[PDB]
Symmetry: D2
Subunit: 466 residues, 4 copies
């Protein structure tokens, strides 16, 4: 009873040794590994410190103008500030753009938008998952609706041309006339090229639909001006605050304000619809500590250092890509305009399914992903590789060329093991063959060692070993 | 780059002076004010430290043993551990109960459950908002569906008896037969009494519906065994991890496993699939560690003692207000809060909350079962969790009751000066634009803040 | 071809002997039986002749002045005329009322209205089936939506007070506030009392809902002014054109025009668009002519007198049964039918309807407000429209009451012989497989049919 | 009060002179006009006599096995008989096919099927309206759902290739994979070619969807074996009972029974779902007089005379088509396989919108319809012409060649008037110019005379001038 007050003041290290130890091991794992998973990054110490603030305590349902409770003087300064920085970072005129900074994450932001502009059973069109689309843009089969987007709304995907790897805008244009979407989504999870927002706006307008961009993956590149901005043609732009923006996990919803079209002119009614959908529609108390973190990240994102960082991200990807091509690997669309590339491993006689597991055992992180061709999702041919994470650690072109070779050594190893299993062997048997065969296990150990020694050469953003 | 590395290692104080200053002022505001808003609390230093961990960086869609990406060895140890502590804290047998610890907050947890068990347009019944219910349990008018629960599903509320302030279980029993709910919700935002879970389970079973408890507000009291547990009769229990549980903001979904009545439970896979890949993306592992830390602290006898104190304080605050002539809805409370009917003093919570706020006494308005209009709620909701975390005891809450009373008297004054009939905007002007009054506020604020500064403020060292 | 032309000019008797024979036997069955099924009637020769017209051949999608195809000069004269007579028959000012005469039947008319005013998942409230409501007003269980109304829309029933047999308007008033209906239905399939349309309009307005009356059963009584008109308080009135109106099978949708409360009515275009191109295709013009013919006949004093006789007969039949010791739900009736609670004789409508059928006395079972099980309805619904069209008067219905009584006694007998507890299939065996009994049936059938043959059978000359 | 009994026995002629007169004028209109509207026909006297039977009186909700009331001995003989004849007429084995004969019309039958197999918001794919599809197969715009099919369900149309006029099965195959239909509809309102049911079954099976044929327009041709049967590949076949089947207005639902697929095999659950949807789902008391009419029509449809009639129907269409082609008219898909043709009037510098009204004034009935090309529905280029109606009146090839010339004289007249109005004149102005200009009005009168004199040469099926 007396120690209750001490309990509240006791550091994590002393209070919960078990959780503390987990964080420590995790921190060390991140340090000695090579992060190539495209959606991964490292938040700055500043951002992380914001999350532990007393901002966790205040309930502030509503918005700066109208909150359900009082005592929000400072919470209001914060959310207002965060909104100012968000618009600023993207060179947006507050008279043409507004922004909601309360979404809990990327998926919640998207859903708030659908709930506001689409409504139950409204039609939505998004990039097909196997072609690089995201779950939240629609995901269903001929017998079931899996994603909440597909469950509560009516979704239909649009594909990429498998012979070029590019989104087939022509086919989408024709299909939109028959499907009658209320909203079209411009955003991807695994696509290395810029999106033709202008074309998509024409198609959207033609069908009277809204054009929503989900820039989650390129949000950081956009700020630095390294890839064309989606704010030029879209009505709404959703995004995560982590990934390439490098903040804590959260989301934001940018929306247009003012005149939409002439004749006499009609206006944008996006603002109130979106805000009401976020609250009291879908969420409760906003997570202010996360809003401060996002704010901090937005300030850092406007610095020339961040600008230079993003140029480096894209340059590294180009270098990594060229080095892999020189090694004989096939890159979808032949290359990239951004931070990632999709490597078609068919060019090496294997698949991303087996490759990702072998590379993981070597402490090289990345993930499998189907290539536009692929006649089966149960054996994706590609590997998605992104440069954001390692670039935040200071890796430059030369470093990524060395990384390309580690990955290659990995693919060679994966091929070795596969040939040692059989043509009709299962992924489970493959994984087991890799775990219980000292022969391959020796190869793994040796490559892991080089991979981790090379990784330890670079700093690990965050708190002092936390 | 030279400076790029340092930008990422730089402290918040130096990196972003503006945000830092805001936190500082906020920290100070919390310190000198008296927090009586029932859903507020103070997270421990340990919990807050977890949020700043490198756990922020890892993407772990899926679940332990079912991850999309590799490299989740430690994230798995964490989520698994968090689940173990969640079941443990509530004395739940892992063969009868399972738990999802990925919800981003209270509302997201509820929605995941509806999406899993109810499905589009499925019927849901919950306590009517004006009678103390929560938005996420249903909120619509005769012309519009406001809450996402009411938009994507078909909701119908059940009311409390305005003459007793208690949920009218009889009427709910009759209406369930006509409405045919697929799910009934047992949980509140402003109700001072224990819920008759057993009765609700009978009604749910009768209609073949699921009984979901939303213990967000009493989750902490439940752990300490200070109020009956909803795990005894419900099929599912959702909850926030903050509020009375005192963790960081997040949510959890407890669900039954095993035999239901041979017929088994299919809750687990439905709920997990709804959370992901259904509604969410990457879980927030730093928040999961925070919840884990909070669950360990919640099993300590200190936490147990804390919760007893919370309820004792509420009883004391309640008695002191009754002695001062205030009317408490249902006459008293079984938990951490009370709904004070200000009609007994000739005013409303709408005007009272603003005057008390100006005096640095935080609380909020809320309609009382009677109330013939939501635009003039008669009550004030007051909770003891926050101040109890600061060490306040019965004697302290009696002093607090007096400050609140001085406040009510002041609100009434600004009311007599405005006339028996005046808008709320007129009242506020008289409050902020009257020598004697703005002066009255200043004087009470001073005493309120001096008394408040006598107690410690949980959290990180010095902001 | 030589014979092809004649095949199309050939009479039914020569063309299809098998179908012809069926009609003949059916015609004879109708002649020698006693029709007491409340929804049955006999269409006049004039009405039937219209159905065989060349009006069958013309496709006229759309409406007068709004046709898809040309060549509708006469179809337009017809539909326009039919609309004029419909409004006229009910004393409706064409500036306050409009009417759609294309519905294929009663159910299609109701559905068109829901589709127009309610829309997918919109809420609808109607009388509970077991309390005398109609399928199309809502029909679902706790596990399944059976009626298309319950499948495409969200329905919730309102009940009658089992102690009085009257619709409990108070409870409906309270439930409407919680359910938030978009449309409330005033109409029944088995209810002997007038509906409190005024009360229902107050409740509808309070919730901003539309009040739709489904007068299918009393449409004829309404025309003759024998029961209060639903056109006084409702916004929409749907109806079958057969039953008590005595036309061919079809339906109509009456809707208000002008000012509702400035706010006007938008019913017309919504309803018309829902019927077409919404739900139907080419209208059945031969049926529209039949309805027109029936509406002209319905405005004659002869029809007026007929309807008075219908209600008088019901009163007489009712009194004779009461004198015989039978219990009538709500004690009596205001219209053409009565619901007889057979519990007062130790049996149920389920067994009674089958025995009476075997005696050539037609009627059907129906649950009484009390009834603790639909698998053993206690009542028998009896209507006087059909026999009244055959000329039966009070004295005749008293004789009919006795035949029915002899029937009930017989059903009870087959019941005593089967034991206080026996399935329905056992009862039927004893009925058809017992010297004394099948013999009892034969004897009563004979008297029933001899008495029935004393009256004329409306329709075409000789089939 | 006394005459009440007389009132019930009074003939229509004496009872309601006004309605009687209308029928008479209508009967005469049908006699002197030339019916080319593809969905029109003339019911036989036998069929019409059935409609006036005492069958109008009996309420029989439910089905032969289970009715809500008793006294259905004969109604049961009737519905049972009608079902037997329906299956028989189409050479269907009652162990593989079942049939519901209670639908009130064509549209109600389709809706009962959607309600049974698709369910609320289920996806449905049908031929696009402007390409010859039917309303009940789906009809919506980018802002509104008009047809009840589009309101209660989620529909998406599939188009015909505008360069060939044929349904583009390839595109439909691709789109079905993205749309995930639960049911695909094979049926048309204005399409002159046979449907590739086999191809559609492959596509349906691929997506696990049901294949429903709506043979309303070719139902009669199918019975006579003049066009391939949809019962060979479809799971369900809906149809009107009038149109080419020549019965009274009603509808039927044919559905498969027995084994569906192997592996071990799964069965068809269509029967109970469809029956329950019709009742107590959507309808109330069946219209027995209409069921007898359908029965009578089904018996007549199995006669060699009917068989010969249908061959004549198709031969006439071929002749009408050739005569119009020789006159320089463009027929969509170049010709027809059935009872109708879609004439593209662009080949004559006018549209079906103006043409249908001029031809109507000349007592030549037909209707406008957009041609696959058409860049606007507000000016459809085609005229749909069917031969069923006139063929029932005995018209043969020579007769249809004369009809082709009357129609041509009509088109020439329509062109004359249009040129007399202006390039940007409205259809309303065109219609008014045709009604208030004695010059054109004289042309109309003269052609009408020839048209009606020639029409009076043939018999008019039905009752003696009724
Ligand atoms: C990652 C990603 C998301 C999901 O973000 P969460 O924060 O995990 O919920 C949504 N959309 C796109 C385009 C993404 O890349
Ligand atoms: C507070 C509360 C919630 C909402 O929690 P959030 O974390 O704000 O999103 C849900 N349900 C009940 C019963 C509550 O008290
Ligand atoms: C009979 C009846 C109906 C149904 O009419 P149908 O013509 O059978 O389709 C609808 N509503 C009420 C109130 C009825 O009595
Ligand atoms: C005509 C037609 C219909 C409509 O029939 P109705 O009886 O008018 O309701 C439905 N489907 C198709 C394919 C048609 O040709």
């Amino acid at each position: 009873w007396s120690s209750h007050e001490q309990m509240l003041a006791q550091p994590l290290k002393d209070s919960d040794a078990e959780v503390y130890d987990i964080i420590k091991k995790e921190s060390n794992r991140q340090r000695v590994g090579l992060e190539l998973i495209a959606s991964e990054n490292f938040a700055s110490r500043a951002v992380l410190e914001a999350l532990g603030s007393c901002l966790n305590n205040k309930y502030s349902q509503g918005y700066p103008g109208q909150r359900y409770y009082g005592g929000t003087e400072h919470i209001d300064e914060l959310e207002t500030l965060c909104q100012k920085r968000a618009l600023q970072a993207y060179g947006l005129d507050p008279q043409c753009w507004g922004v909601n900074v309360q979404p809990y994450s990327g998926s919640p932001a998207n859903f708030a938008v659908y709930t506001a502009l689409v409504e139950p059973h409204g039609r939505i069109m998004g990039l097909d998952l196997p072609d690089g689309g995201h779950l939240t843009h629609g995901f269903m089969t001929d017998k079931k609706k899996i994603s909440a987007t597909s469950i509560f709304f009516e979704s239909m995907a649009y594909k990429v041309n498998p012979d070029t790897g590019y989104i087939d805008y022509d086919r989408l244009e024709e299909n939109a006339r028959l499907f009658h979407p209320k909203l079209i989504i411009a955003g991807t999870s695994c696509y290395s090229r810029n999106l033709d927002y202008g074309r998509l706006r024409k198609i959207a307008d033609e069908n009277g639909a809204y054009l929503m961009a989900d820039m989650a993956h390129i949000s950081g590149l956009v700020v630095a001006g390294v890839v064309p901005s989606p704010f030029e043609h879209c009505h709404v732009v959703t995004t995560t605050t982590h990934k390439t923006l490098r903040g804590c996990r959260a989301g934001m919803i940018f929306y247009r304000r003012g005149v939409r079209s002439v004749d006499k002119e009609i206006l944008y009614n996006l603002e109130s619809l979106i805000n009401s959908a976020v609250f009291p529609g879908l969420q409760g108390g906003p997570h202010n500590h996360a809003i401060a973190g996002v704010a901090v990240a937005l300030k850092q994102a406007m610095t020339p250092e961040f600008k230079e960082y993003q140029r480096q991200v894209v340059a590294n990807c180009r270098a990594l890509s060229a080095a892999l091509v020189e090694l004989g690997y096939k890159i979808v669309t032949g290359g990239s305009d951004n931070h990632l590339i999709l490597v078609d491993l068919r060019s090496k006689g294997t698949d991303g399914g087996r490759a990702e597991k072998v590379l993981e055992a070597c402490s090289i992180a990345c993930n499998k992903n189907t290539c536009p061709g692929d006649k089966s999702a149960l054996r994706p041919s590609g590997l998605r590789l992104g440069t954001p994470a390692l670039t935040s650690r200071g890796l430059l072109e030369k470093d990524f060329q060395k990384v390309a070779h580690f990955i290659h050594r990995g693919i060679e190893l994966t091929v070795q093991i596969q040939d040692d299993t059989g043509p009709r062997a299962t992924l489970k048997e493959f994984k087991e063959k890799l775990a219980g065969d000292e022969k391959h296990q020796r190869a793994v150990r040796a490559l892991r060692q080089e991979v981790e020694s090379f990784a330890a050469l670079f700093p690990l953003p965050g708190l002092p070993g936390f």
